[PDB]
């Protein structure tokens, strides 16, 4: 699609609309880097991993009725890396495309006298996410607060409207410190007053057919409206 010619509500301008740049807000040694297999893999494994633990109602959270395996998008990806070319977080910009109308983001920020190595970066982000389980609730899952500590990170990992993720990452330095941004883009986004996912007495009870590696989620080909929320 032509970015540039998909409008979105609010008229706001798309990420993905006219030629890459890096924002002045990146100082003067900004570089995108590439997300290769390898982190692509690791990121899927991690939020396969945490989806799969909470679908069989660990960590005193429900059990999920049909939580699908995520796979990796790459229209979605290269979105994100686009917004990391701005080293802001949040902004107001679009970022919907064909297929996932509204797609959630998570964006994980770095701040240290050395620049960790990509890895590194992923892994201070699961790290993050990972965390968040104090904090989040069976009251959160049943109806979906943001703010109350975090949980977002958590909270958009494990929505069973999300089918699919894409990452990208821009470091610099500014400040007298290294610096980074790793945005994920989600197909989906949890939806406040609404459930996370839906609750089952089994895991997967839902599911129209449950994968093999993650026992207690939906295979790839589970038909998961992204577009739908709970
Ligand atoms: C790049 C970050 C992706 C989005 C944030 C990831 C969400 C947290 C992932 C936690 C994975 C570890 C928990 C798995 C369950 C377990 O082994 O106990
Ligand atoms: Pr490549």
Request: charged share 30%; net charge positive; with cysteine.
């Amino acid at each position: 699609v032509n970015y540039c010619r998909l409008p979105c509500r609010g008229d706001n301008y798309h990420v993905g609309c006219g030629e890459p740049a890096y924002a002045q807000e990146c100082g003067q040694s900004p570089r995108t880097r590439e997300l290769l297999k390898e982190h692509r893999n690791e990121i899927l494994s991690k939020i396969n991993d945490v989806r799969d633990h909470v679908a069989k109602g660990s960590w005193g959270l429900p059990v999920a009725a049909r939580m699908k395996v995520v796979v990796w998008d790459a229209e979605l990806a290269g979105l994100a890396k686009r917004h990391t070319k701005g080293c802001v977080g949040e902004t107001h910009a679009c970022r919907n495309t064909e297929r996932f109308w509204l797609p959630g983001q998570l964006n994980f920020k770095y701040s240290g006298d050395k620049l960790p190595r990509i890895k590194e970066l992923i892994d201070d982000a699961v790290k993050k996410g990972h965390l968040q389980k104090h904090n989040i609730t069976r009251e959160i899952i049943e109806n979906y607060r943001e703010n109350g500590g975090d949980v977002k990170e958590l909270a958009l990992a494990i929505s069973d409207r999300v089918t699919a993720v894409g990452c990208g990452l821009t470091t610099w330095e500014d400040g007298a410190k290294a610096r980074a941004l790793l945005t994920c883009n989600f197909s989906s986004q949890n939806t406040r007053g609404r459930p996370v996912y839906k609750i089952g007495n089994s895991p997967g009870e839902k599911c129209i057919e449950k994968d093999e590696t993650y026992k207690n989620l939906c295979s790839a080909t589970e038909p998961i409206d992204p577009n739908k929320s709970n």
